[PDB]
């Protein structure tokens, strides 16, 4: 699982704020947080493709305790 | 390929990135100080 699907947040903790939290705790190589063609907004529930599978597990364990945009962030292995 | 440098034993640095061969691991962090 190279990507950690990080969610449990809001639009304030977007893909870029998830990249900032990746620069804090465990880094994300890419972000897969796409949106619809009518909305076009990052909900923050996206697959942060981390540096490795161990980096995605570190996002799933250590970085999945933030109160990201008021809600508790939860990342899972993807 | 990062697992490739893990098998090399050199850390994932710019000097390990500059080499594409297996023999570049002899100039690792445990070569000079």
């Amino acid at each position: 699982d190279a990507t950690v699907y990080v969610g449990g947040l809001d639009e304030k903790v977007s893909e870029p704020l998830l990249w900032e939290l990746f620069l804090q705790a465990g880094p994300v190589v890419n972000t897969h947080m796409p949106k619809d063609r009518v909305t076009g907004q990052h909900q923050g529930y996206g697959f942060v493709e981390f540096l490795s599978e161990e980096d995605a597990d570190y996002a799933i364990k250590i970085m999945n305790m933030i109160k990201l945009y008021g809600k508790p962030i939860r990342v899972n292995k993807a | 390929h990062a697992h490739g440098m893990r098998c090399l034993g050199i850390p994932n640095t710019a000097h390990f990135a500059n080499v594409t061969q297996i023999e570049d691991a002899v100039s690792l962090w445990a070569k000079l100080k």
């Binding site: 304030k12 903790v13 704020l17 990249w19 900032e20 939290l21 990746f22 620069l23 804090q24 705790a25 465990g26 880094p27 981390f50 540096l51 490795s52 161990e54 980096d55 597990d57 570190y58 364990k61 250590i62 970085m63 999945n64 305790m65 933030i66 109160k67 990201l68 945009y69 008021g70 508790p72 962030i73 | 640095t13 710019a14 000097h15 990135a17 500059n18 080499v19 594409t20 061969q21 023999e23 570049d24 100039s27």
Partner: protein
């Protein structure tokens, strides 16, 4: 007639400075010796790019200008925009009518406000280093967002005072496997404001 990248790594003290094509030069040892100093600059990569230097943006639009703070404090933009909009609402008949019969008052605020904006309110800008190379990017990589350090939004929305809610998890994991050189102050490395580590 030339040595490989491993032989250049053995010969030179900076194996990362040995490029892929710089060993194909006539004097690669002299090129590496010139590039090994701390006051050297790289070649801009348009020699390797088919796309020309700052030509292939082609699908974006940008804001034109942001005035400095002393110019905005004098405020030439407001009556300049008012004069431009009045000229736009003018007809061309009114344009040469005002040409043959002009009127007073272009701006005419004062002189020492602009004088103090140029001299007393003058602020020195953030000039970059001697070795900065500008390219198609070179204005966006400002994160070096320190590793092991959170953000101001993460400090504000998660209620972290200047104590993150993932600080115990970060201290229990120790150094993360993504960034083993990251320092996390307050939980792992016993840090002001947003940047709570290095």
């Amino acid at each position: 007639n030339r040595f490989t990248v491993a032989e250049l790594k053995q010969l030179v003290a900076r194996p990362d400075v040995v490029e892929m094509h710089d060993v194909t030069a006539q004097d690669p040892k002299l090129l590496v010796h010139l590039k090994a100093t701390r006051n050297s600059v790289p070649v801009p990569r348009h020699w390797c790019f088919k796309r020309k230097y700052l030509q292939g943006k082609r699908g974006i639009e940008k804001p034109p200008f942001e005035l400095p703070d002393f110019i905005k404090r004098t405020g030439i933009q407001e009556m300049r925009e008012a004069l431009q909009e009045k000229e736009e609402q003018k007809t061309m008949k009114s344009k040469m009518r005002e040409k043959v019969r002009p009127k007073m008052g272009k701006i005419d605020i004062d002189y020492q406000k602009l004088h103090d904006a140029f001299f007393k309110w003058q602020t020195k800008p953030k000039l970059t280093i001697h070795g900065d190379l500008y390219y198609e990017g070179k204005e966006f990589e400002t994160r070096l967002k320190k590793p092991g350090d959170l953000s101001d939004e993460l400090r504000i929305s998660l209620g972290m005072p200047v104590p993150p809610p993932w600080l115990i998890a970060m201290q229990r994991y120790g150094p993360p496997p993504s960034y083993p050189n990251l320092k996390i102050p307050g939980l792992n490395s016993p840090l002001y404001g947003d940047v709570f580590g290095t």
